[PDB]
Amino acid sequence: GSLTEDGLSYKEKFVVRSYEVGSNKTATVETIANLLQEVGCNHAQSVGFSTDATTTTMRKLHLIWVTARMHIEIYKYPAWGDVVEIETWCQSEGRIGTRRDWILKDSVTGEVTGRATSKWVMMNQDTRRLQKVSDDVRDEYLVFCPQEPRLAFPEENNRSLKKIPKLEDPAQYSMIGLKPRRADLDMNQHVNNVTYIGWVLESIPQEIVDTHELQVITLDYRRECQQDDVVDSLTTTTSDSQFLHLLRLSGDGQEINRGTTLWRKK
Amino acid sequence: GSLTEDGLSYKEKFVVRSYEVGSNKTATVETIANLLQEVGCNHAQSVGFSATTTTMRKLHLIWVTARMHIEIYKYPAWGDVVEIETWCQSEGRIGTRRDWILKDSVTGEVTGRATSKWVMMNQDTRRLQKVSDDVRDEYLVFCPQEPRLAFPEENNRSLKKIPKLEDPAQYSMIGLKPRRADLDMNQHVNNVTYIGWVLESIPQEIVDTHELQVITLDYRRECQQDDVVDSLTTTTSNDSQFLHLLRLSGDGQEINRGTTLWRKK
Ligand SMILES: O=C(O)Cc1ccccc1O
Numbered sequence A: 001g002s003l004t005e006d007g008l009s010y011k012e013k014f015v016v017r018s019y020e021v022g023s024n025k026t027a028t029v030e031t032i033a034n035l036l037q038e039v040g041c042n043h044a045q046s047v048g049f050s051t052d053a054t055t056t057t058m059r060k061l062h063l064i065w066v067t068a069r070m071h072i073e074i075y076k077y078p079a080w081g082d083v084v085e086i087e088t089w090c091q092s093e094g095r096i097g098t099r100r101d102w103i104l105k106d107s108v109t110g111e112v113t114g115r116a117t118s119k120w121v122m123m124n125q126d127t128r129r130l131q132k133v134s135d136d137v138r139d140e141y142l143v144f145c146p147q148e149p150r151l152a153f154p155e156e157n158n159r160s161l162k163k164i165p166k167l168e169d170p171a172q173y174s175m176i177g178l179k180p181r182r183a184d185l186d187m188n189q190h191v192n193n194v195t196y197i198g199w200v201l202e203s204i205p206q207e208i209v210d211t212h213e214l215q216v217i218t219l220d221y222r223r224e225c226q227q228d229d230v231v232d233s234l235t236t237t238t239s240d241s242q243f244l245h246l247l248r249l250s251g252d253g254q255e256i257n258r259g260t261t262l263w264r265k266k
Numbered sequence B: 001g002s003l004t005e006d007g008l009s010y011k012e013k014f015v016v017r018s019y020e021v022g023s024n025k026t027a028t029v030e031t032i033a034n035l036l037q038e039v040g041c042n043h044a045q046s047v048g049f050s051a052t053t054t055t056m057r058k059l060h061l062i063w064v065t066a067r068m069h070i071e072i073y074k075y076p077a078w079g080d081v082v083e084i085e086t087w088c089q090s091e092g093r094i095g096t097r098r099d100w101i102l103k104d105s106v107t108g109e110v111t112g113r114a115t116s117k118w119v120m121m122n123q124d125t126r127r128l129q130k131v132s133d134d135v136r137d138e139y140l141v142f143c144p145q146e147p148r149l150a151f152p153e154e155n156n157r158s159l160k161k162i163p164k165l166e167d168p169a170q171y172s173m174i175g176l177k178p179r180r181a182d183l184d185m186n187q188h189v190n191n192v193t194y195i196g197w198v199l200e201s202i203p204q205e206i207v208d209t210h211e212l213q214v215i216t217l218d219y220r221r222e223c224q225q226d227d228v229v230d231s232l233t234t235t236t237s238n239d240s241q242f243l244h245l246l247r248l249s250g251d252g253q254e255i256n257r258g259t260t261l262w263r264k265k
């Protein structure tokens, strides 16, 4: 993959692998989510950030970016053996954080098959206290980002920015006792952001997955699941089919995530 | 990737991805096993299977894994290019063998090798049978006719008999369940997930201080989408060895047994 001519975005092609596809022999939303993460890391690499991102300033003040929110819309899931091209870029939202956006194209047709936007907040690793992006951080970051606004989701008041409410007991559907295994951890032994997308979708009934395709997912990240936590995944039909989602620790019921999904009849 | 010049083996290059690596920023054995599976599928596509032949489709037969044996000398780093070569062979009426050699693209050194035994099963009744002559002939035009072994050694660890772990196990991870990412395109649990479940009962101390060199895994029974699994391990041993058992958490029906070998980093 490569930076574009202007150096303000990054493109990469992926051939969809046999184990990456589900029952329709097309990429799972988890495979898509993994590719977005991979092209994100390859963009950070190419512009001299750490890949574990962190600029030299925020390493000094032991600071890290963590996802507050992920939003993905898929028009077409690529088939097994298809080539998908993904472009990604980053933008400042002042001291309110950072945004990473993706566009997914059919390499052959050049048609837009999906888009995603993610909101990222600055956190002290150790104390894990959120804070506002600090001055010297912004400057060091703006030289890699378009100066004029560039939005995967430009429509003024669009799905990617809706407030998500808290599912109330009792849930229509549940999957309880979900635990991450070593394959679910990243290189720093934290649970991979993508795992949580799998845990949300686990409480969706098999009838829906069999008769519908996932068109939209929005997921808020409230608190991390540690390697030795257990998770319950709750869903309620709010209607296309729509669902409200809650992931919570299996004991005390501490909220780790909430979200919404929209599904189209095949 | 492509078939080699003589059309009797298949090669493919893979760049190791961010999310494919563990704590040492090298590829997990699960990532390796996924790449073996992908290259095996690309070989099958390249010679016109779908891994059923025409005759097998007529009779509703499938190949299933009996055994996977993997030896890793060096796990490729995040961003490394790894080259994998794979071929198959008839073992007469017993079943088929798929073999793999992993190389460092840059140096061309052999960094790993694997071998797997496949038996023929009626898809519907789930009953094993011996490979018929009509199937054998349809497969011999895609396989080298002289033996080609990833594991040629005289007493190689790839062929050893694996005993049944005795209760009590030294270590266990209880209540393991597959999610939808653990299923293949036909809604069966991916062969690779079972590798993941075996390794879950290895203490974190061993994982932090040792590297996996060898794993042998027998496949007895498949885990269904709504089954639950217990993972058992006992030390049998500077090298550490373990005996492994996966069993259904209720009645304790055996699904897998294996051995692992770990060397101090
Ligand atoms: O982790 C990444 O970089 C991309 C990603 C994928 C899925 C959910 C959240 C998220 O931020």
Ligand SMILES: O=C(O)Cc1ccccc1O
Binding pocket: B033, B034, B036, B037, B038, B040, B041, B065, B067, B068, B116, B191, B192
């Ligand atoms: O499934 C495949 O094609 C190859 C494979 C991978 C991992 C374990 C067993 C096995 O046969």
